Amino acid sequence: QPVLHQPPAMSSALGTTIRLTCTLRNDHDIGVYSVYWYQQRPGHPPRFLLRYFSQSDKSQGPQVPPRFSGSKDVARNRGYLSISELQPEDEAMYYCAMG
Amino acid sequence: PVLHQPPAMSSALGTTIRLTCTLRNDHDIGVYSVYWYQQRPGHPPRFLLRYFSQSDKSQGPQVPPRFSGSKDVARNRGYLSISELQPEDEAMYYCAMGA
Amino acid sequence: VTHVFGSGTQLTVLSQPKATPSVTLFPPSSEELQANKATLVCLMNDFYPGILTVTWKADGTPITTTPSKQSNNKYAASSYLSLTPEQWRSRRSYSCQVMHEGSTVEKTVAPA
Amino acid sequence: VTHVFGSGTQLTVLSQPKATPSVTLFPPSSEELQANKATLVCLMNDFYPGILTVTWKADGTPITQGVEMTTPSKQSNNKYAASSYLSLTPEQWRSRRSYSCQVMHEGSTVEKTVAP
Numbered sequence: 001q002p003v004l005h006q007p008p009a010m011s012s013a014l015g016t017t018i019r020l021t022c023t024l025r026n027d028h029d030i031g032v033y034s035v036y037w038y039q040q041r042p043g044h045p046p047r048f049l050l051r052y053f054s055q056s057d058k059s060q061g062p063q064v065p066p067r068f069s070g071s072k073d074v075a076r077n078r079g080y081l082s083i084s085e086l087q088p089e090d091e092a093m094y095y096c097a098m099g
Numbered sequence: 100p101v102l103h104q105p106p107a108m109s110s111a112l113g114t115t116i117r118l119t120c121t122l123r124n125d126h127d128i129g130v131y132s133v134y135w136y137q138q139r140p141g142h143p144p145r146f147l148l149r150y151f152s153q154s155d156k157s158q159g160p161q162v163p164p165r166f167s168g169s170k171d172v173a174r175n176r177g178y179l180s181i182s183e184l185q186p187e188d189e190a191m192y193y194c195a196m197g198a
Numbered sequence: 199v200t201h202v203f204g205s206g207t208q209l210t211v212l213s214q215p216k217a218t219p220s221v222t223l224f225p226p227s228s229e230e231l232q233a234n235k236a237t238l239v240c241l242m243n244d245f246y247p248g249i250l251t252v253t254w255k256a257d258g259t260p261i262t263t264t265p266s267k268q269s270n271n272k273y274a275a276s277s278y279l280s281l282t283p284e285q286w287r288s289r290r291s292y293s294c295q296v297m298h299e300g301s302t303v304e305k306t307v308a309p310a
Numbered sequence: 311v312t313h314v315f316g317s318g319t320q321l322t323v324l325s326q327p328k329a330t331p332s333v334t335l336f337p338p339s340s341e342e343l344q345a346n347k348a349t350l351v352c353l354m355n356d357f358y359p360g361i362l363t364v365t366w367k368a369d370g371t372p373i374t375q376g377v378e379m380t381t382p383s384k385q386s387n388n389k390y391a392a393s394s395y396l397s398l399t400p401e402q403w404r405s406r407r408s409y410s411c412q413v414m415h416e417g418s419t420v421e422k423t424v425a426p
Contacts, residue, residue, distance in 0.1 A: 004204035009249040009299075011210045020207050028199055036313070038144075040206075045193055046136075046144055048313045062314060083209075091211040095143055099200035102316025109322040118319055126311060134201070138318070140384065141264050146201035160202065184323050186388040191318040196311050222349055224336040227424075237334050239353050241395060243378070263392065266381040276380050276393040278353060307341070 001025065004096060016086045022079035022096030034058075035070055035079035036097040046095065049081070101126070102194060114184050120177035120194035131196040133170060133177035139190040147179070151198075210247040216299060217272060219245035223294045223305040226286055236286040238279040238307070240294035248273035250298040257289045328416070329389055331357030335411045335422040338403055348403040350396040350424065352411035359416065360390035367410035367421075 052070030150168030
């Protein structure tokens with residue numbers, strides 16, 4: 001029931017496109033928050049991937065490829081992180097955050 | 100290296116310790132708030148606090164007062180202090196800038 | 199909600215066939231029970247991706263390590279339950295329920 | 311600069327009380343054997359610091375294959391736990407007079423033994 005929800009695990013084959021989901025509890029409006037996404041590999045610091053509020057208000061992280069991109073489904077209170085051209089290095093933990 | 104953090108630090112149980120986050124010279128920390136996060140092995144990062152000044156700051160949800168921020172504008176430093184150290188406090192601590 | 203993080207999603211880029219965990223549940227040994235102690239261990243190995251949840255149950259009712267990499271590049275994990283010899287012998291059974299990639303494998307043992 | 315995480319800093323809380331691991335060794339389970347399968351498990355818990363090494367032995371002779379070990383993980387009680395296992399064939403488990411699990415933790419050594 002807590003504030004943000006993320007499936008514990010997702011998997012896909014090389015070269016494909018996947019979309020990770022971040023769901024915000026229905027007692028809050030995602031339409032008022034920007035969604036933040038971070039990537040983290042074993043024994044490494046969290047790495048800011050991108051921040052997305054809307055199509056005219058978003059920003060890419062330092063040296064983070066365009067194949068990484070966010071969006072939203074405000075009706076469903078969902079935050080999205082899409083990664084296409086999936087590569088091995090993409091294997092890692094991904095965290096979303098609101099604000 | 101924009102942000103700099105000493106890789107490791109230690110102190111005894113029930114003691115108080117202070118961590119240092121140094122910003123890079125070519126940036127005025129006087130225009131940034133300092134964000135501190137704690138992350139224990141196996142867990143997501145946890146927001147501790149936000150600190151701009153004695154008059155402009157915020158505490159993380161369910162975070163004890165034993166954790167307190169501050170800064171040295173002159174030296175471009177961001178500080179995190181932890182009182183009454185206990186085992187659980189053993190973790191990685193990251194800082195970040197923003198506003 | 200500001201600055202609050204989600205539990206995170208582990209993404210694995212498939213580099214080998216998916217494999218459901220092999221699960222073995224060990225009951226307390228005879229000598230451990232002679233030392234007035236009882237411990238059950240649930241061993242899970244040869245699974246991929248390396249993410250799963252474990253749940254212990256006592257006669258049907260639920261009770262209230264992190265995956266690591268094997269030589270054969272598949273993953274393994276273990277969990278244990280501390281009981282008194284009385285609790286062990288007084289329940290019809292204990293179980294280790296392992297959920298992986300949406301499937302569930304559960305093993306049970308009785309106080310024999 | 312904004313939103314970028316600085317490399318972190320590992321904090322270690324000093325003066326924590328040390329604890330020699332308790333070692334519990336389990337022989338192949340009955341269900342396992344009835345399925346023509348055998349696995350030995352060496353469970354180590356409640357030890358601090360969380361660093362140790364294990365040596366498996368067959369009839370007093372150290373082994374060098376089939377040996378794996380889960381990573382030491384901090385429990386609710388702030389002490390660590392971990393387990394090591396040895397996969398064998400039912401014939402291997404019955405071929406020896408004994409198997410051992412030798413755990414070494416900071417100048418302490420504790421070895422348990424099991425036999426068919």
